[PDB]
Structure 1
Amino acid sequence: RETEFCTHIAHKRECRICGNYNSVYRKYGLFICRRCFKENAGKIGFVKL
């Protein structure tokens, strides 16, 4: 089975908090979701004007 299990190799970039591939915010180190990120931005410290 392992001959083909995940035989394709591609990035599977996923949000660290959620696990979702779509819209991963890889601006820098963060790979956070866009819907996962504005929820925890105060803990990461990012804040608005």
Structure 2
Amino acid sequence: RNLGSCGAEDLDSRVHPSTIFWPTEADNASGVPMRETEFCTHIAHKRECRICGNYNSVYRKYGLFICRRCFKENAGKIGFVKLH
């Protein structure tokens, strides 16, 4: 299909090549381009606790990215202290 296409009059409607605004969160995977054609073509953020691979109930405040449940266990070492 590399030697085919649509009408020119329709091509004017092509989506603006301006890069998409829906990226994927990387806490720290090199951004690089059969089943490969659509293994995970759908693009969406996948923010998740950097401890447990769980995408539910994650704090993004201050750039933590820690599950609320897994927060209590490590809070003591992380520095947070329970007073007042």
Q: TM-score, normalised on structure 1?
A: 0.90
Percent identical pairs in the alignment equals: 100
**CA-to-aligned-CA distance 1:16-39 (integer Å, 9 cap, x gap):** 011100011111111000111111
Q: Where do 5+ consecutive residues of structure 2 fail to align? A: 1-34
1:1-49 to 2 correspondence within 5 Å?
1-49=35-83
Taking the aligned partners of 1:20 and 1:41, their CA distance within structure 2 comes to: 18
Compute the displacement of 1:2 (Å). Answer: 1.2
- Structure number with greater Rg is 2
Taking the aligned partners of 1:10 and 1:21, their CA distance within structure 2 comes to: 12
Compute the displacement of 1:47 (Å). Answer: 0.9
Q: Which structure has more strand as a fraction of its residues? A: 2
Q: How many equivalent residue pairs? A: 49
Q: Report runs of 4+ in structure 1 exceeding 3 Å deviation.
A: none
Query: Root-mean-square deviation (CA), in Å?
Result: 0.8
